[PDB]
Amino acid sequence: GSHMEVNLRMSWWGGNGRHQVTLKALEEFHKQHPNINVKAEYTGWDGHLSRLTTQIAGGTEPDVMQTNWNWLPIFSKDGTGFYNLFSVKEQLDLAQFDPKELQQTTVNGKLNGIPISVTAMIFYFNDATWAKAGLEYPKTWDELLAAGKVFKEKLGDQYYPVVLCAGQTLVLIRSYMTQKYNIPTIDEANKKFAYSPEQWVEFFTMYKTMVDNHVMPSTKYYASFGKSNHYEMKPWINGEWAGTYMWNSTITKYSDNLTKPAKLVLGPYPMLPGAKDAGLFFLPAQMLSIGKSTKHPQESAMLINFLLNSKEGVEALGLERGVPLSATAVTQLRASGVIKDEDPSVAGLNMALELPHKMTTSPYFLDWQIWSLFLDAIQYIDYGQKTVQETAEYFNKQGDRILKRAMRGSL
Length: 411
Ligand code: NA
Ligand code: NA
Ligand code: NA
Description:
The chain has about 400 residues and is α+β, with helices and mostly antiparallel strands.
């Protein structure tokens, strides 16, 4: 015999804003499932992965948990680290999602989590400065280059079409190489980067070409824009740095620091002639997953479904985790006015979802050691320690060593 009630545990992280709405959502869940209880185990980001790690190791994790995309390779290299969500297809309306984004959270045939929202880096431009320069936004890569020189001569040496940190520049070039070559960037199975030597040379050649054309400040100005914070620097506020390439889901920071009436507007995504693939880096912002060892996979799956697809759950959660991916979810929030097509974040996402997106991405491309190394490599170019060639060989070699380490055996 079993019991009158089912007891579930769920974990998530965030600020009080996120806590409040999910707490709310759990009351609504319990109203519809009065014999399913939920113990809410939540904290801020700091310390979270560490607590969950030690729980997951000893089979003590919650039934349902908010997870990060890059946790898949940590706890689920062979795809069995979390419960296979295809097995609770009956409780969990998978029809509300698409294969493109479900594939990112599938590992060795197993649906390891449901992406709550997705985001990708795209271009946003300052309309006032581009008006001053007398330019339309770039539709091609060469137009982006061409813009650099117009910005320099027609407005000044302090004006740039965009401002980019190392990480953005890395994702951006990757995007260009994907358009040109249609090859994957990380060779997953062999724990190494996939490009050939020539292509790494090309990669950095591209970086040099962008800088030489005044597309964005080089790393000699790294003292200036080298911040998870440069949307507060004067060049940003004043429209000197006239655009960025950035996750659509985190553009409001930049948008809000512009001296109005200047606005930050969605740009085209530049394409090579007859590219079959735009090469965006799509990234699920977070996921709901089910504990591998849950005694209640069905009820766990009901909770996830309720938070993501139900009217009440959807209404309560709002945008506290980004713009929902669930089709019923976004239809609901559009009708309620919560999601506004004119919001730069939503317009960018919409455009992004619609660009050709053949090639797929590895969580290891966003590894911070990798990003840190790319910053090193471009400075060696800007400060004259290495030619493009030498830098390329360097990045390929050290890049491989950082990967093998991060994908097992570190040490
Ligand atoms: Na019993
Ligand atoms: Na292509
Ligand atoms: Na929602």
